[PDB]
Write a protein that binds this DNA or RNA. Structure first.
Lengths: 53, 147, 128, 52, 187, 225, 125
RNA sequence: GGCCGUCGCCGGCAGUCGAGAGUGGACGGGAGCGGCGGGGGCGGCGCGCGCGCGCGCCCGCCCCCGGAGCCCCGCGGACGCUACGCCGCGACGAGUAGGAGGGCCGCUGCGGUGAGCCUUGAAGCCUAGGGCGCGGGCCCGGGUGGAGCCGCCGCAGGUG
RNA sequence: UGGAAUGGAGUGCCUAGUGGGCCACUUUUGGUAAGCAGAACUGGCGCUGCGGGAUGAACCGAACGCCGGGUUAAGGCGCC
RNA sequence: GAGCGCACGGGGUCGGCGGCGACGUCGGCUACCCACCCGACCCGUCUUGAAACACGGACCAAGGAGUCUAACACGUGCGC
RNA sequence: GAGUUCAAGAGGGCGUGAAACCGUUAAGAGGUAAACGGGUGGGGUCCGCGCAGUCCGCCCGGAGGAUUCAACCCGGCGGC
């Protein structure tokens, strides 16, 4: 019976959350793609610094 | 781990919690904080004493950055410096007094609390306090502002 | 391989004549297995005189006779030969009953060893 | 514990080589299986693919 | 039959409560053989303190220990803390302790050993002082957790001084009615 | 080392046999002293009777200092005040009994639960019998059967009570240490009385078995062992 | 740390087999099976074990070397005893006691060696 | 009175004497023909085999643990000590709604692990067959079947 | 430590079910009365079996682990 | 100044006591399969009250749900 | 019937083939519907035997044997 923190919480749309995303499984397969962008960009502009201007 | 839950030991019981004299239904007595002013009054008046009403003086675009002012007590005022520093009283060209920044460590106000070892100091910080300025003086050191 | 077992006590049982569950009138949809009747009008849960018996921990057996086969030993399910040599020391109160999956090629291998070690087997040659 | 003993290095054909190496300090740390179990049955849950 | 009531027949502090990990299990395997065969009580009190929950062996500050080993007639004795022993940056003065405790924090171990003191573990102690002679026994502040500012007379009763649960501290959550008499209600 | 320790074994064993033989004389002469006292305490009651009759005066005997209380009604339907009284006499099971010292503080206690106990004055034979057959002592809250004099002594040595005979005297002639010698005795458990009781739900004055039965409780203790 | 490396393996599935409410252990150097932490040979510092000789006749006694660290290749010292039955017991009885070498197992070892020598003939009963 | 279980004894065990068993190595003198001059007190505890188990000065050996012999073993095993084990005392036991503990009760998959089982026959299915457990259930025999399956430690769940 | 008798107390959290009740000796309001409605005290039934009242919630006896021997309470002892 | 014993109406039973039937018959608590004689209302649920002339239920197999999952928050316990 | 097949108790909606339900054979029984809590009778059943059970286990005497290298020690050699 209510004897605790008097809080109220946001997941309260009677239309789905699920219309709005709920997953994050990319980021181990995303961190790899980005690293391929840097590792191909770095070799493209050969001598100039790889950390931009 | 569903093999530790109590529902796994609650098979065979005709209701397994929530009884049978009143089979507690989908939601009796409002969803969420319903009532709370006229039929949950008793719970709201002895576990959240002040909940309905307001105290005025609104601020409209509160930028909490301009009110940043963390405080460091005098007890842990020698923690901001190394150990070669504090130990030296008349050693290693630490003469009458060393210097302690506080704006560097991240804190601005110097609040007074606790004894401070008897060594002359120059506490530099953007603010101060009356006791915290008295105690530093009483040790032999000086209070210096900076901005 | 039958020795005289170590000590031969009187294996007296309070009961093990099976406990059947209430309502197996004509119901094949109710098994002989037991499930404590958790009804509210139930004549068995209520411990009536002249109903079925209902298990309670007063039917237990002796601490020092429980799990004792009628012949005097106690069982041990043995899969191969090298799960026998454990019984080479506690052989005067433990019988090595062989499992159901072993082929008849090496059941003769296990039974042959039990003769040597004087390990009683409750299940000597069943296949040929 | 303490006083790390001397480990003797073996060659490509057995027949322990002359050179020796002191036993590294790691091999004396507390054992405590309830860590190598709780730190395991988590780090074995991090390769799961989703299923639904 | 008899007409006794059975509420209290079972006791929640049994012949033996819990213990968890192999190193602790060995300790309890020791301090049980010392508790039941010696005729002392320091062993019994330490035994019944190796069972307790991590919530009932709160850490002992280095400062707290000094102020209890400074008292008159208490020098030359080995303090005994069944919990852990944290450092304390608020002590600028040199101790000369001699301690025996389960877990001593890296900074606290760096300081006690530095000053010339000595640090002991609960298996060195059984050899040195089996019957429990020469030991000052201590304990961390048991009701020092944050939660105990919540237990007590429920908030919102006339003289209760108990901290109520809240989403945050600020202007509008605290004082609406029941916290300021201009709003019709204050206890 | 052998020879000196050899003496150690004999001195201890002999001192043990030494001490034992000393005890047996002590316990012996006690009951001899008591048997003289019980006899005299009897014929000093006959004496006072006869000497009055010759002169025409009446000898009113003593109100008795003991009372054995046996519970005759089970748990069911027990009233609140009653269940507290007869739980202070430590009667917590039908057909249990304890010796109760008698005085105005306790008489009113035995008036409250008068429909629940059948109590009278035990004769020496009963207190002899109740303690020799049903005498279990409350040692460490673990009742154990009194089959030796160590058990009584090791828990009553501070009052002089050292033997089975003494534990009967203090209960019988309530002494300066009656409370403990009555507490050391775990309440008796007495079988159901053979021969019936002719009714449980009525006072003994109306011809049933409950309430004060001053001298007939000797009968109901014969039938419950 | 003989106790410590027992706290780790007291129940962790190494050699234990638990069936029909009986606990058994299958090690080298374990003069029984049912018991534990007095007959393990993997654990202690000095363990004696009695096992049948390879050649099919007689019995073999294996003592653990104390000197020398945990080099498993030469940790265990082996020997062959091929005598009459009675002198075989005297050899094993002499070795365990007169060396004072872990005498917990003097009586268990003798009975182990008897049954090993018993089965090396036509069965007697 | 037997048996089971729960609970209590802040229970006993590193091999237990305590239902009261009142401890040691020396020194110096006198030395003790047995022990510490507490009892008709009749009140917790002060006599009959002490100075033989086996062993000595004008041999030594406190007897290599060729046993201190223990009628309990303190370096030292009972059926015995998987301490998460083993054992001893007592008191008690009903219970829907409800709570908790224990399951070597059961189902499906996974990381280890049984030099596991299996065409000289697995999974399943049947069974007036032999048994264990109070019980969840399990194990074995017989028959049919025709290719996979189970135990132990942990893990997870669309688990009865 | 200072009236009798009894056994150990003190203390902190988290809390599911319940908030449709009924019966009896007594005391008792409305009613003609009710197997009616409404109150106090205690004990019962619900949650509870067992011997007896032929039968039965609630009356009398009595409180339940599995058993052997003995004796009982309330009831009874023509035959069933 | 010293061993023998009855041990004992003694820290819970032992015989340094016997006999039968065994190739046309023995034993099976366990635990069976049928049958005979002695005691017993149909289960689940609402209910103060169930066998109820209260409702659901012909029978069998499989599927089948007070929770599962995410987020809060509280307390308890485990390890840094 | 014969035959192919390892198998047709793999026959062309054919791997394994339970329960409800049905036929038939064997066994037992029958006027208070069937069904349910204690012993006897029976069992197309099985299970373990059994003309004896001189059951094993250590230690002593006995008369036969037999190995003697053999027990004892002593010396050599190796391991702990």
């Amino acid at each position: 019976a209510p004897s605790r923190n008097g809080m109220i919480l946001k997941p309260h749309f009677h239309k789905d959350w699920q219309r709005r995303v709920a997953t994050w499984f990319n980021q181990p397969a995303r961190k790899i793609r980005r690293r391929k962008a840097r590792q191909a960009r770095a070799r493209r502009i050969a001598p100039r610094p790889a950390a931009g201007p | 781990p569903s093999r530790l839950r109590k529902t796994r030991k609650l098979r065979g019981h005709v209701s397994h919690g929530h009884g049978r004299i009143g089979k507690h239904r989908k939601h009796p007595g409002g969803r969420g904080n319903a009532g709370g002013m006229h039929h949950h009054r008793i719970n709201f008046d002895k576990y959240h004493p002040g909940y309905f009403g307001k105290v005025g003086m609104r601020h409209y675009h509160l930028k909490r950055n301009q009110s940043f002012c963390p405080t460091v007590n005098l007890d842990k005022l020698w923690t901001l410096v190394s150990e070669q520093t504090r130990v030296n009283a008349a050693k290693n060209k630490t003469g009458a007094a060393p210097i302690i920044d506080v704006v560097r460590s991240g804190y601005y106000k110097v609040l007074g609390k606790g004894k401070l070892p008897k060594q002359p100091v120059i506490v530099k910080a953007k603010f101060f306090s009356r006791r915290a300025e008295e105690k530093i003086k009483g040790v032999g050191g000086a209070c210096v502002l900076v901005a | 391989a039958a020795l005289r077992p170590l000590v031969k006590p009187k294996i007296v049982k309070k009961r093990t004549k099976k406990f059947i569950r209430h309502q197996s009138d004509r119901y094949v949809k109710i098994k002989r297995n037991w499930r404590k009747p958790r009804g509210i009008d139930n004549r068995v849960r209520r411990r009536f005189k002249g109903q079925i018996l209902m298990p309670n921990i007063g039917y237990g057996s002796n601490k020092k006779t429980k799990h004792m086969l009628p012949s005097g030993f106690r069982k041990f399910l043995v899969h191969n030969v090298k799960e026998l040599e454990v019984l080479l020391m506690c052989n005067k109160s433990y019988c090595a009953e062989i499992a159901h999956n072993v082929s008849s090629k090496n059941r003769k291998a296990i039974v042959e060893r039990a003769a040597q070690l004087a390990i009683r087997v409750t299940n000597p040659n069943a296949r040929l | 514990a303490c006083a790390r003993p001397l480990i003797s290095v073996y060659s490509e054909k057995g027949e322990s080589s002359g050179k020796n190496v002191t036993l590294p300090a790691v091999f004396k740390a507390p054992i405590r299986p309830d860590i190598v179990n709780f730190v395991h049955t988590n780090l074995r849950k991090n390769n799961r693919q989703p299923y639904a | 039959g008899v007409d006794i009531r059975h509420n209290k027949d079972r006791k929640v502090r049994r012949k033996e409560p819990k213990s968890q990990d192999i190193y602790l299990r060995l300790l309890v395997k020791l301090y049980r053989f010392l508790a039941r065969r010696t005729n002392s009580t320091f062993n019994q009190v330490v035994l019944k303190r190796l069972f307790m929950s991590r919530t009932n062996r709160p850490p002992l500050s280095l400062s707290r220990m000094i102020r209890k080993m400074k008292l008159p007639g208490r020098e030359n004795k080995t303090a005994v803390v069944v919990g852990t022993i944290t450092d304390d940056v608020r002590v600028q003065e040199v101790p000369k302790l001699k301690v025996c405790a389960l877990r001593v924090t890296s900074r606290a171990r760096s300081r006690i050993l530095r000053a010339g003191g000595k640090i002991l573990t609960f298996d060195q102690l059984a050899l040195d002082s089996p019957k429990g002679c020469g030991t000052v026994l201590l304990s961390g502040p048991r009701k020092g957790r944050e939660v105990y500012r919540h237990f007590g007379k429920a908030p919102g009763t006339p003289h209760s001084h108990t901290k109520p649960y809240v989403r945050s501290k600020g202007r509008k959550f605290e004082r609406a009615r029941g916290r300021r008499a201009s709003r019709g209600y204050k206890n | 080392n052998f020879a000196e320790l050899k003496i150690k074994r004999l001195r201890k064993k002999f001192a043990q046999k030494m001490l034992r033989k000393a005890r047996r004389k002590l316990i012996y002469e006690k009951a001899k002293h008591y048997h003289k006292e019980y006899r005299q305490m009897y014929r000093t009651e006959i004496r006072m009777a006869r000497m009055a009759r010759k002169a025409g005066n009446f000898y009113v005997p003593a109100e008795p200092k003991l009372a054995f209380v046996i519970r005759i009604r089970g748990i069911n339907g027990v009233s609140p005040k009653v269940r507290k009284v007869l739980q202070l006499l430590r009667l917590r099971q039908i057909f249990n009994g304890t010796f109760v010292k008698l005085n105005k503080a306790s008489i009113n206690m035995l008036r409250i639960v008068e429909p629940y106990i059948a109590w009278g004055y035990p004769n020496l034979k009963s207190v002899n019998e109740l303690i020799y057959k049903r005498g279990y002592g409350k040692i460490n809250k673990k009742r154990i059967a009194l089959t030796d004099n160590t058990l009584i002594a090791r828990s009553l040595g501070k009052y002089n009570i050292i033997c089975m005979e003494d534990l009967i005297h203090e209960i019988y002639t309530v002494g300066k240490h009656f409370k403990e010698a009555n507490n050391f005795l775990w309440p008796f458990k007495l079988s159901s009385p053979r021969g019936g009781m002719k009714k449980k739900t009525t006072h003994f004055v109306e011809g049933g078995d409950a309430g004060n039965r001053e001298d007939q409780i000797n009968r109901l203790i014969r039938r419950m062992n | 740390s003989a106790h410590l490396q027992w706290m780790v393996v007291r129940n962790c599935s190494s050699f234990l087999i638990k069936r029909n409410k009986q606990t058994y252990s299958t090690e080298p150097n374990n003069l029984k099976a049912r018991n534990s932490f007095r007959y393990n040979g993997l654990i202690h510092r000095k363990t004696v074990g009695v096992e049948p000789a390879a050649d099919g006749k007689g019995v073999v006694v294996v003592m653990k070397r104390r000197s020398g660290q945990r080099k498993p290749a030469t940790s265990y010292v082996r020997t062959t005893i091929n005598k009459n039955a009675r002198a075989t017991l005297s050899s094993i009885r002499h070795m365990i006691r007169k060396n004072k070498y872990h005498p917990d197992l003097r009586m268990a070892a003798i009975r182990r060696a008897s049954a090993i020598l018993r089965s090396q003939k036509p069965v007697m009963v």
